[PDB]
Amino acid sequence: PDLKNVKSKIGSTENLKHQPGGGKVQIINKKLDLSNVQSKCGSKDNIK
C-alpha cells in the first residue's frame, strides 16, 4: 500500500523567482535660455 510519497500536479512553479521589481522615473527638466535681452525704452547715445 505504500504510494511512494506522490508529488503534486501542477503548481505555481513558474512564479518561484518572481516578485516582481519596479522600474524608475526622473522628471526633471532643462532650463530655457533667456540671455538674449536688452531694453529699448531709454537712451544710450543722446544722454552724452
Added chain:
Amino acid sequence: LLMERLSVDYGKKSKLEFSIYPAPQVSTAVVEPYNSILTTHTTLEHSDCAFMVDNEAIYDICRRNLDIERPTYTNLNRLISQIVSSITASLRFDGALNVDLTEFQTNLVPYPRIHFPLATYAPVISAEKAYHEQLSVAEITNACFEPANQ
C-alpha cells in the same frame, strides 16, 4: 492672429484695444499666464496701445463704490460701457475739447512697448450716496486717482 493681419492690410491706421487683463488671486482658467504672455509678445508688435481692465477690481467697485450685493458679469459689463461711451464721446458728440483715437496714442505712449495703460471711471455709486455727495469736478477727479477705485 488678427492684430497682424490688420497690420498687413491697413498699414498706418490706428489699432487700440479693450482688454480684460488677468486677476491677482482669482482665475477663470488655469493656463491664463501662458495665454496672456503669448498674446503680449504679439501685442508689443502690432497694437498701438492697449487699454486694460481687471475683473477682480470691478467686483470690489461693486462692493464698496456701487454697493450692489451680488455682481454678475452683466452688472460688470454695464459698468464697462460707461468707459467705452466716454472713450468715444468726441467722435459722437460736440464738446469744448476733442480727444481722438490718435490723441490717446500720442499722449499715453512714450515708447511703442510702454503702451499698456489702465482705465478707471468715476463716479460709480447708487442713489443711496448720490443724494449725499455734491459731485463737483474735483471730487470726481480725486475719485479716479484713489487706489481703491482703480
